[PDB]
Amino acid sequence: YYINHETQTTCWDHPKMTELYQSLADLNNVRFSAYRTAMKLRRLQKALCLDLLSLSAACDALDQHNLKQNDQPMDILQIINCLTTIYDRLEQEHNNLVNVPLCVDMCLNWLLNVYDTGRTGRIRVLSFKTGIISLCKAHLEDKYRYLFKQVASSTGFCDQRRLGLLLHDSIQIPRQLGEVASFGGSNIEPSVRSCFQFANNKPEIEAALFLDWMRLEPQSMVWLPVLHRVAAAETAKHQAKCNICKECPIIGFRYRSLKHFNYDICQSCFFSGRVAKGHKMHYPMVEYCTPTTSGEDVRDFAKVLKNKFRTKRYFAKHPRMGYLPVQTVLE
């Protein structure tokens, strides 16, 4: 690695990953926390070109090398051979989009940076699979059923300690990028307390209970759905315009006002804060990823009309403090 004596810092940044990290620092302009993180890992996922890796290939990779001892220490040699074989297979399938040496170096260096800050060349294989499957591009329900099955025993049961390990391994990623404090920091215990309060202090937690628990935007996990949501709104074209920068049409997200008529703003105009004189941005908004339908438009019209007669500032939120869960679209 690299040693900086003047700052006394140990760095494992790949030069390509160094360029990626500089780009992330430049794109830090988003004032919002988890939206900025979602954009950042989207940049990283597109950069290391694993989005074209399928989930079934991930199952084949994990079950091919017989890696089922979750507590077994992992050495550099085994992971490099497995990862090289996987990217060689990907190049066999994606010859025009896969560079095996660069890809394996990027993946190994990424994992080394995130999970092995202790400079030991060893990391729990459970953390490895959780990270590589969180970065993996796939659907949603399959992801949760897979990681629950991975953590649960043959009976499909997961105790408090297991979910604590998963919580820690999950928050490891925001810790790498120095924004874990927004999701509550390294303290995973409050998440366990909330999950047990939901489950009325049940002795054990099953798959369906965990599904229902996370389907209500848990504070520490917001970076899983939002990420996918961003992945669902990178090629969406709306039939509208941005009232600030005169974009036509909006590509990507769409944001609609509620206490105004014929007001819409693009994603960049929203995160950056192009403050046009006359109207502020501290009012309730509505977020749209997919192109809208007529029913949604008329319902928004009705909501605006109803709000027009519910004035006098019943509820106000001037500071940001974290305004991530704007509104649910229910796909």
CB 287 within 8 A of CB 254: yes
Stretch that binds another protein, among 6-14, 162-170, 244-252, 263-271 (CB under 8 A): 6-14
How would you class 272 by CB atoms within 10 Å of its CB: exposed for 0-12, middle for 13-18, buried for 19 or more?
Answer: middle
25: partner contacted, choices another protein, Zn ion, none (Cβ within 5-8 A by kind): another protein
Q: Terminal CA-to-CA distance of the chain, rounded, Å? A: 45
- Binding residues, as ranges, are 242, 245, 266, 269
Contact string (CB under 8 A) for another protein, positions 166-185, x = contact = -----------xxxxxx--x
One-letter amino acid at 52 equals L
CB 284 within 8 A of CB 231: no
What tokens appear for 329 in the block? 């679209």
- How far is it, in rounded angstroms, from Cα 104 to Cα 49? 11
- Interface residue with another protein, options 15, 26, 261, 280 (CB under 8 A): 26
- How far is it, in rounded angstroms, from Cα 266 to Cα 155? 48
- Interface residue with Zn ion, options 133, 209, 245, 286 (CB under 5 A): 245
242: partner contacted, choices Zn ion, another protein, none (Cβ within 5-8 A by kind): Zn ion
Question: Is 319 one of the binding residues for another protein (CB under 8 A)?
Answer: yes
Stretch that binds Zn ion, among 19-27, 84-92, 236-244, 304-312 (CB under 5 A): 236-244
52: partner contacted, choices Zn ion, another protein, none (Cβ within 5-8 A by kind): none
Contact string (CB under 5 A) for Zn ion, positions 310-329, x = contact = --------------------
- Interface residue with another protein, options 45, 134, 186, 268 (CB under 8 A): 186
Long-range contacts of residues 181-190, Cβ cutoff 8 Å, at least 24 apart? 182/33, 182/34, 182/322, 183/34, 183/219, 183/220, 183/221, 183/222, 183/223, 184/219, 184/220, 188/164, 188/220, 189/164
What is the distance of C-alpha 322 from the center of its chain? Answer: 16
Contact string (CB under 5 A) for Zn ion, positions 262-281, x = contact = ----x--x------------
> What is the contact surface with another protein in residues (CB under 8 A)?
6-9, 22, 25-29, 36, 177-182, 185-187, 319
